[PDB]
Amino acid sequence: SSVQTAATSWGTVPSIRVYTANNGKITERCWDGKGWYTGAFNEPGDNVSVTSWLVGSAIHIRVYASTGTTTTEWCWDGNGWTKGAYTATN
Amino acid sequence: SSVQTAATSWGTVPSIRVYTANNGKITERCWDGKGWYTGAFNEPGDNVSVTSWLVGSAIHIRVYASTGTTTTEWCWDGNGWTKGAYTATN
Amino acid sequence: SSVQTAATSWGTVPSIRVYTANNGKITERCWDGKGWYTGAFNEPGDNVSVTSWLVGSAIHIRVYASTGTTTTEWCWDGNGWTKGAYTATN
Ligand SMILES: OC[C@@]1(O)OC[C@@H](O)[C@@H](O)[C@@H]1O
Ligand SMILES: OC[C@@]1(O)OC[C@@H](O)[C@@H](O)[C@@H]1O
Ligand SMILES: OC[C@@]1(O)OC[C@@H](O)[C@@H](O)[C@@H]1O
Ligand SMILES: OC[C@@]1(O)OC[C@@H](O)[C@@H](O)[C@@H]1O
Numbered sequence: 718s719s720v721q722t723a724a725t726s727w728g729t730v731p732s733i734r735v736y737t738a739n740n741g742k743i744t745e746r747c748w749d750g751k752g753w754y755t756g757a758f759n760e761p762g763d764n765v766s767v768t769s770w771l772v773g774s775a776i777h778i779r780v781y782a783s784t785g786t787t788t789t790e791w792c793w794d795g796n797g798w799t800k801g802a803y804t805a806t807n
Numbered sequence: 808s809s810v811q812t813a814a815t816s817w818g819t820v821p822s823i824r825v826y827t828a829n830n831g832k833i834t835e836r837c838w839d840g841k842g843w844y845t846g847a848f849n850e851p852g853d854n855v856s857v858t859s860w861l862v863g864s865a866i867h868i869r870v871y872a873s874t875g876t877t878t879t880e881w882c883w884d885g886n887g888w889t890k891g892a893y894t895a896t897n
Numbered sequence: 898s899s900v901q902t903a904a905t906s907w908g909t910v911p912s913i914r915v916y917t918a919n920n921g922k923i924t925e926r927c928w929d930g931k932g933w934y935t936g937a938f939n940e941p942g943d944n945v946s947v948t949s950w951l952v953g954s955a956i957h958i959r960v961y962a963s964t965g966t967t968t969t970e971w972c973w974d975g976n977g978w979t980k981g982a983y984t985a986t987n
């Protein structure tokens with residue numbers, strides 16, 4: 718019923734991404750230094766966590782979206798979100 | 808009823824901050840290398856996430872506190888907690 | 898009933914650790930660049946958060962596991978998980 722969030726950031730400006738799980742849907746809000754805006758991430762789930770890392774200037778983000786006991790990893794590597802190889806046996 | 812936590816850290820010592828949402832209140836415990844102590848952060852919410860980054864030696868922390876479907880961003884930039892510009896339309 | 902996750906990463910490969918709280922047990926899945934595998938972390942709790950930092954090449958991880966209103970810190974410093982000094986008065 719109530720929302721759950723996860724957050725990551727990179728750089729010095731910085732860039733910030735905030736993921737919100739709300740009523741079974743996870744969405745993304747973005748800051749790149751001047752105004753919040755809506756990101757491309759849209760995936761189902763009731764729970765979210767996130768981590769990210771830089772390779773030089775290139776950001777890589779991994780979002781772990783869970784529904785029930787099933788966790789799906791979503792990957793940003795500069796050119797769209799794709800499903801990752803993560804599995805777990807919950 | 809049960810608590811929910813979020814954590815961030817910076818440096819090599821390191822500094823650690825742990826935020827706990829408990830019965831609608833979010834509080835902060837701190838480690839700077841020698842003993843845990845209570846931090847200045849006190850804001851309402853049932854859910855918390857956090858991210859942080861360094862600009863040189865200066866730490867910046869962003870805490871995302873949610874109550875119901877409403878998320879408020881709180882900002883530490885070295886001189887007190889202030890409300891951030893984050894909005895979302897949950 | 899539904900799982901809750903936390904995630905951290907380090908380096909450029911990168912290394913990723915995903916912690917899952919499920920039915921009162923927290924477990925760990927690991928990525929070091931080529932295949933997911935099960936980590937050594939096994940501790941009780943209904944809620945998990947995590948942070949990590951590098952000292953040179955040496956990773957240090959702190960997992961905050963909560964049951965009810967009681968939070969226990971677990972420490973990885975390269976040679977096994979040990980209970981940390983964290984306390985809180987929830
Ligand atoms: O600039 C916004 C954006 O491209 O940033 C990287 C990822 O967070 C994307 O989902 C997002 O749309
Ligand atoms: O390039 C995608 C990928 O290999 O990135 C590292 C890990 O997140 C993997 O699960 C994932 O499939
Ligand atoms: O040294 C403790 C402290 O000043 O560290 C920075 C922020 O975490 C503050 O809320 C906190 O009181
Ligand atoms: O200086 C505060 C601020 O600009 O920092 C970056 C973002 O966290 C913004 O939402 C926030 O208002």
Ligand SMILES: OC[C@@]1(O)OC[C@@H](O)[C@@H](O)[C@@H]1O
Binds near residue numbers: 914925
């Ligand atoms: O390579 C896996 C491993 O050793 O990595 C460091 C920690 O995450 C441990 O719990 C884990 O078993």
Ligand SMILES: OC[C@@]1(O)OC[C@@H](O)[C@@H](O)[C@@H]1O
Binds near residue numbers: 823838983
């Ligand atoms: O070496 C372990 C330890 O000192 O590391 C820093 C903090 O996580 C402390 O709570 C913890 O006991």
